[PDB]
Amino acid sequence: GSEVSDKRTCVSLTTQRLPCSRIKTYTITEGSLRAVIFITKRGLKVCADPQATWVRDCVRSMDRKSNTRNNMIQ
Structure with missing residues (x-):
């Protein structure tokens, strides 16, 4: 369904809004x-x-996490 x-x-x-800490x-x-x-x-998506x-804050927060090379995807 919404999986893929x-x-x-x-x-x-x-x-x-959603808490920016819930951003995966x-x-x-x-x-x-x-x-x-x-x-x-x-x-969930x-x-x-x-x-x-x-959103700009979070989409950029994750973007900022992508500056440094350590992405914990768990």
Whole structure:
């Protein structure tokens, strides 16, 4: 169902916030509608609005974690 899909697994974006500590990893989808998918630490996928300030903080927080070479994906 929602397990695998790729491309754009979802078309709706969450504008409301999630704790940035629940961010597992993100994937930005590029096209005409850009959506950033965040996986939560529970292992579920969430889709978030990339122009949300909190999203920008987290999508960039994970981006910042990608500057240094140590990515604990667990």
